[PDB]
Design a binder for this molecule. Structure first.
Ligand SMILES: CC(=O)N[C@@H]1[C@@H](O)[C@H](O[C@@H]2O[C@H](CO)[C@@H](O[C@@H]3O[C@H](CO)[C@@H](O)[C@H](O)[C@H]3NC(C)=O)[C@H](O)[C@H]2NC(C)=O)[C@@H](CO)O[C@H]1O
Length: 122
């Protein structure tokens, strides 16, 4: 995956959690479409710098999508006061700018850790 502050192991786990790390296309999720490997929404894509040729094209690329995640965490993680490790990045990914502070994302983290090789992933 693209490099940055999020570890390759963490990205692999999030990728698996979101789509079994496959180009699964889009799904309507809580009001808007989530697409590709990391199930990135359009707002998330805009916030991570609009990488790739387009939102859906980027989302369908494991590299572009992961770069977006890297940029998103670089932009919001520390700002939101998140633990600068997968637990925080994963929660930010699922809940937004302050997702790591939302009780809502506690379940996401616990479910992600049930994935082979992802328990306590950093
Ligand atoms: C991987 C993914 O798509 N995760 C989804 C989250 O992104 C989404 O939370 C929402 O994230 C967007 C994008 O960061 C938030 O919009 C931004 O909010 C900031 C701060 O308030 C604002 O300055 C930006 O302009 C704005 N960006 C845009 C492009 O509109 C939005 O507030 C988040 N929504 C909530 C309710 O927290 C969550 C939504 O549940 O879904 C994940 O799947």
């Amino acid at each position: 995956f693209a490099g940055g502050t999020v570890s390759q192991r963490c990205l692999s786990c999030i990728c698996k959690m979101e789509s079994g790390c496959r180009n699964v296309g889009c799904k309507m999720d809580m009001g808007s479409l989530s697409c590709g490997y990391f199930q990135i929404k359009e707002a998330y894509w805009i916030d991570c710098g609009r990488p790739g040729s387009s939102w859906k094209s980027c989302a369908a690329s494991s590299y572009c999508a992961s770069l977006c995640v890297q940029n998103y965490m670089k932009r919001y993680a520390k700002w939101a006061g998140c633990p600068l490790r997968c637990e925080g990045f994963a929660r930010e990914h699922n809940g937004g700018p302050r997702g790591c502070k939302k009780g809502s994302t506690i379940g996401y983290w616990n479910r992600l850790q049930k994935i082979s090789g992802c328990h306590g992933v950093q």
